[PDB]
Amino acid sequence: SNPVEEEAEKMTRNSWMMLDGTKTDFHITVRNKSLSCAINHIKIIPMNNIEQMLKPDYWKKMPPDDLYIMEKQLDWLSKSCVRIIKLITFDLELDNTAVPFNFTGFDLLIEYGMSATDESCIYLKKLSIPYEVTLRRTIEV
């Protein structure tokens, strides 16, 4: 019997504008009690790497496709903005969802927040929150 120790450590329809949400909802952040983050998050700012995927999808589309960076990946709608933190909860940052150039291919989003309280060791378990958002077709050419 080989033991170890025990160490204690929903959106709505959006147009093509930019919505900045300051979130103070029921974030768990499952530490012991009164979790001070000690390096706070001010603005998370997603929908940047979705554009940094979408412009190479255009460029990937420019020649014939042979899965150079499109190989079964459904990570457009994932929106995995990893919130890295340092060492009873705290309010979340400003969103700035900022849909000014994004495809109609997605109809959902998620997130992941690194819950961290490190004492001379490596990092810890990590908590993820999804967000369902629909988009409005405001204009076409």
CB atoms within 10 A of CB 42: 7
Q: Rounded distance, CA 46 to CA 119, Å?
A: 30
Q: What is the resolution of this structure in A?
A: 3.7
Select from 115, 93, 85 the least CA-distant residue to 24.
93
Question: Could you tell me the CA-to-CA distances from 50 to 28, 46, 80, 100, 135 in Å, in that order?
Answer: 27, 8, 9, 11, 15
Q: Rounded distance, CA 57 to CA 61, Å?
A: 6
How many degrees, rounded to 5, is the angle at CA 133 between CA 104 and CA 107?
35
CA Rg, the chain, in Å? 19
Whether the Cβ atoms of residue 20 and residue 92 lie closer than 8 Å to each other: no
Q: Rounded distance, CA 43 to CA 20, Å?
A: 9
What is the helix (H) or strand (E) element at residue 59, kind and residue range?
helix 51-61
Q: Give the DSSP per-residue string, 8-58.
A: -----EE-SS----B--S-----SSSS---SS--SB---SSTTHHHHHHHH
- Residue 89 identity (one-letter amino acid): T
Three-state DSSP state, 61: helix
The method recorded for this entry reads cryo-EM
Close Cβ partners of 5 (under 8 Å, ≥ 6 residues apart):
none
Helices (H) and strands (E) in the chain, counts: 1, 4
Sequence-distant contacts of 39-44: CB under 8 A, at least 24 apart: 39/85, 39/86, 40/90, 40/93, 41/83, 41/85, 41/92, 41/93, 42/93, 42/94, 43/93, 43/94, 43/95, 43/96, 44/81, 44/83, 44/92, 44/93, 44/94, 44/95, 44/96, 44/111
Distance of alpha carbon 106 from the chain centroid: 14
